[PDB]
Amino acid sequence: SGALDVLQMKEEDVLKFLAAGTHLGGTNLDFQMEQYIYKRKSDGIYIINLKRTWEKLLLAARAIVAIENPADVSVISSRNTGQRAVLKFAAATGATPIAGRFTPGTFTNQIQAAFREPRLLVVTDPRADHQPLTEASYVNLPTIALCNTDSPLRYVDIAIPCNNKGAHSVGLMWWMLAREVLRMRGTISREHPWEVMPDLYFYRDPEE
């Protein structure tokens, strides 16, 4: 980075990452996903580094800020875990959520009453939301997403590594993303702790 400590790692957030198990990562690698891994464990787990997570969070977020009108940075997730997360995301920062089954042809059509035309996309898990990704390259959208350690990289301009096999790893990462964009664009910045909880960005989950 280059800012003094106000765009660099904080002692607090390290604890939150490790409590939510984001550092742990799946038992497979790609030829593009080996530049964020450090090494393997005794176990089949492959340990994502959090330094490498932190830088990628920032320039990803700075691009989300750069649009003049935030009302067309369309977020998407279809897996259950990333549903509750995206809804709070797009409430907090001006965005348009697309929860559940995508319904393809959304941006390709001209005649469709659910037609959209955003600029950016922020997708959870490339290999569950493959339909909008393929469709991104017909309308010249930049793309950002959360990769595991083995998700295919293709139509992903920038990645933000994560564990993302569920748990608290999903909701935590979307919460952190929303923290950063408000520090930069808004006036929420104070470098002293944000009021909003990462708790209500987690999965609803079958209740008591």
Partner 1 sequence: MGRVRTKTVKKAARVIIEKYYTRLGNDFHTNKRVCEEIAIIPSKKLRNKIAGYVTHLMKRIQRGPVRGISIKLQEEERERRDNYVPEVSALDQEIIEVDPDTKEMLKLLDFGSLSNLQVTQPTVGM
Partner 2 sequence: GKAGDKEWLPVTKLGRLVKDMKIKSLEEIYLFSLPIKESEIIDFFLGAALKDKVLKIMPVQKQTQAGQRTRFKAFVAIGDYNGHVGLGMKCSKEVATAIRGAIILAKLSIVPVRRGYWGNKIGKPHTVRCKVTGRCGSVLVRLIPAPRGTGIISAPVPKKLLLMAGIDDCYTSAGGCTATLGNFAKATFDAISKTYSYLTPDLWKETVFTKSPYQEFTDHLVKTHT
Partner 3 sequence: MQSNAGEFVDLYVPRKCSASNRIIGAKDHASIPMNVAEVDKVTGRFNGQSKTYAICGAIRRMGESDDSILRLAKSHGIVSQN
d(CA 117, CA 96): 11
The mark string for 4-23 relative to partner 3 (x by CB under 8 A, - otherwise) is x-xx----------------
Q: By CB under 8 A, is residue 193 in contact with partner 1?
A: no
Residue choice 138, 187, 190, 207 for contact with partner 2 (CB under 8 A): 138
| 86-125 positions binding partner 3, by CB under 8 A | none
Q: What stretches of 43-108 show up as alpha helix (H) in DSSP?
A: 50-65, 81-92
In terms of Cβ atoms closer than 10 Å to its own Cβ (0-12, 13-18, 19+), residue 61 is: buried
| 50-69 positions binding partner 2, by CB under 8 A | 67-69
- The pairing of beta strand 144-146 with beta strand 120-124: parallel
Tokens of 40: 């393997």
| 173-202 positions binding partner 2, by CB under 8 A | none
> CA separation (Å) from 110 to 46, 132, 201?
45, 16, 34
The mark string for 27-66 relative to partner 1 (x by CB under 8 A, - otherwise) is -----------xx-xxxx--x-xxx---------------
Residue choice 185, 198, 201, 202 for contact with partner 3 (CB under 8 A): 185
Residue choice 71, 91, 158, 200 for contact with partner 2 (CB under 8 A): 71
Answer with the entry of partner 2, partner 1, partner 3, none that 69 interacts with (C-beta below 5 to 8 A by kind).
partner 2
d(CA 200, CA 88): 8
β-bridge partners, 97: 75
Per the CB < 8 A criterion, the answer to whether 104 and 117 are in contact is no
43 Ramachandran zone, left/alpha/beta (phi>0; psi -120 to 50): beta
Q: By CB under 8 A, is residue 117 in contact with partner 1?
A: no
Please give the residue ranges that form the binding site for partner 3 (CB under 8 A).
1-4, 6-7, 32, 35, 51-52, 55-56, 58-59, 62-63, 65-67, 137-142, 152-159, 183-185, 189
